[PDB]
Amino acid sequence: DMQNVITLDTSFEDAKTQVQLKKIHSSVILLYCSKDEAVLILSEARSLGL
Amino acid sequence: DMQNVITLDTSFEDAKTQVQLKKIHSSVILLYCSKDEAVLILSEARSLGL
């Protein structure tokens, strides 16, 4: 059964990544980007409660 | 019901203040501290989408 899917894709500043990770975070969060963007997103996740 | 509490032992260093401000999820916030400290905390929250 398909669950809720919410997608946002823009820069990592202006209060986007933090709120996006805080919202709709239940299980199996997918990351899909290039090397540098993946490194930045995972660093932000480590700095946050994810 | 309250979710958790945040201490902010450091004087806004070590990047742990962002972690403590992001780990909360309640819609009601009762921040209380010195004038400039409160101003900078709420500015960081605004830049963090809080």
Curated annotation (Swiss-Prot), chains A, B:
Subcellular location: Cell projection, Dendritic spine; Cell membrane; Synapse; Postsynaptic cell membrane
Domain of life of the native organism: Eukaryota
Role played: Component of N-methyl-D-aspartate (NMDA) receptors (NMDARs) that function as heterotetrameric, ligand-gated cation channels with high calcium permeability and voltage-dependent block by Mg(2+). NMDARs participate in synaptic plasticity for learning and memory formation by contributing to the slow phase of excitatory postsynaptic current, long-term synaptic potentiation, and learning.
Disease: Epilepsy, focal, with speech disorder and with or without impaired intellectual development: An autosomal dominant, highly variable neurologic disorder. Features range from severe early-onset seizures associated with delayed psychomotor development, persistent speech difficulties, and intellectual disability to a more benign entity characterized by childhood onset of mild or asymptomatic seizures associated with transient speech difficulties followed by remission of seizures in adolescence and normal psychomotor development. Rare genetic variations in GRIN2A may be associated with susceptibility to schizophrenia, a severe psychiatric disorder characterized by hallucinations, delusions, disorganized speech and behavior, cognitive impairment, and social withdrawal.
This protein's domain notes: Contains an N-terminal domain, a ligand-binding domain and a transmembrane domain. Agonist binding to the extracellular ligand-binding domains triggers channel gating. A hydrophobic region that gives rise to the prediction of a transmembrane span does not cross the membrane, but is part of a discontinuously helical region that dips into the membrane and is probably part of the pore and of the selectivity filter.
Entry's family note: Belongs to the glutamate-gated ion channel (TC 1.A.10.1) family. NR2A/GRIN2A subfamily.
Subunit structure comment from the entry: Heterotetramer. Forms heterotetrameric channels composed of two GluN1/zeta subunits (GRIN1), and two identical GluN2/epsilon subunits (GRIN2A, GRIN2B, GRIN2C or GRIN2D) or GluN3 subunits (GRIN3A or GRIN3B) (in vitro). Can also form heterotetrameric channels that contain at least two GluN1 subunits and at least two different GluN2 subunits (or a combination of one GluN2 and one GluN3 subunits) (in vitro). In vivo, the subunit composition may depend on the expression levels of the different subunits. Found in a complex with GRIN1, GRIN3A and PPP2CB. Found in a complex with GRIN1 and GRIN3B.
Protein name: Glutamate receptor ionotropic, NMDA 2A
Gene for this chain: GRIN2A
Residues of the full protein shown: 199 to 248 of 1464
